[PDB]
Symmetry: C3
Subunit: 115 residues, 3 copies
Amino acid sequence: NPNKPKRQTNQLQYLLRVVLKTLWKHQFAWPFQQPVDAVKLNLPDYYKIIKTPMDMGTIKKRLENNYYWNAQECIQDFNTMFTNCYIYNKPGDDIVLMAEALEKLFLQKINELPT
Amino acid sequence: TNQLQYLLRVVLKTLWKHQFAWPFQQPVDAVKLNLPDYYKIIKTPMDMGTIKKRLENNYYWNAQECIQDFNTMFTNCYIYNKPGDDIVLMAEALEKLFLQKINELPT
Amino acid sequence: RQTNQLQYLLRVVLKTLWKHQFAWPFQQPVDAVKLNLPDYYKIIKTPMDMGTIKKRLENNYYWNAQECIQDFNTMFTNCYIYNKPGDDIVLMAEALEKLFLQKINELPTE
Ligand SMILES: Cc1cc(F)cc(C)c1Oc1ccc(C(C)(C)O)cc1-c1cn(C)c(=O)cc1NCC(=O)NC1CC1
Ligand SMILES: Cc1cc(F)cc(C)c1Oc1ccc(C(C)(C)O)cc1-c1cn(C)c(=O)cc1NCC(=O)NC1CC1
Ligand SMILES: Cc1cc(F)cc(C)c1Oc1ccc(C(C)(C)O)cc1-c1cn(C)c(=O)cc1NCC(=O)NC1CC1
């Protein structure tokens, strides 16, 4: 059989080196690279309305510091980042269209994930 | 479950969160605490801050190397301090818990 | 993800080279602002140092051990590209590279 097996690439590595690295470069990334700072924008309600916060900053730390059990867990944190943003903001805001753009892209990049 | 993941996410998270963790979350600062002989007596100092950093930054060859570091932390404390001491009773509690958690180590 | 090979590069190879007398110029980027080298970041299109390599091993950057080896090579060749041969600094890299090549020969498989 001259057909050799398709290359075995790790999923979480791909998440760091490919998925995250793409989202991070993108022009709309900056509001998601650190946590939402609810002091410095006047919003003392943020932390009551958002159960469990999330950002690419934290996802990056986690990929770099052996946090994630499996690639499923890392994806959860991405979804949670977006869904946090859609809840706490009023649809058709600017933050929401930026998040919708990063999500469209996210789902492209996830679809080409290895196995 | 890779054993080193279990040590980071379960063993250390449990211990780090405990009442008595704080004296163990960073190196014993012999200068601040004004203990000149500490580094002479304790040849291999150790603490949860350093073990955490090691788990996060791929230092350990395997789980047993990481378990020895926890044991070093506890015994270092039993060597340097006198029994009965507050610091010792705390380390004793953490050891008890550390051992319960190590009994559910996957293989 | 972290193969026993990458483990060897962190614990044995990098640790050995970091401790050597000649390491210090390769422990962080060449600060070309400080040294008044405007041509450096123009002649060296892919800078490397052991600082960056240490970071990358600690933070699961590498696809595999061989990508890390590539970084070490680039570090040494960057040095040989920018600097006149015979300079103090080149002889230092050569010393470290000789030592690298020794340690890399005992690299385990899988
Ligand atoms: C406030 C704001 C004005 C803009 F023009 C564009 C953005 C993205 C804005 O949102 C942020 C700007 C800065 C920051 C910092 C860097 C401080 O964390 C965060 C946000 C912001 C980010 N995320 C993820 C959100 O879900 C919501 C955010 N702010 C919404 C906000 O404060 N809205 C107030 C007008 C009502
Ligand atoms: C000094 C002390 C007084 C107390 F009332 C309780 C504790 C735990 C104490 O121990 C420590 C307090 C702070 C620190 C800091 C955080 C600065 O590194 C360390 C210790 C301490 C911790 N561990 C693990 C030790 O083995 C020994 C420590 N020092 C005890 C000490 O100085 N003992 C001599 C004064 C008798
Ligand atoms: C300039 C110099 C003089 C010496 F006596 C020894 C060394 C290693 C020297 O090189 C460096 C000294 C410091 C630094 C710092 C730490 C600031 O980034 C870098 C270098 C240096 C390092 N590496 C890896 C190089 O390839 C080249 C470096 N300097 C080249 C240099 O500045 N040459 C000047 C004559 C042009």
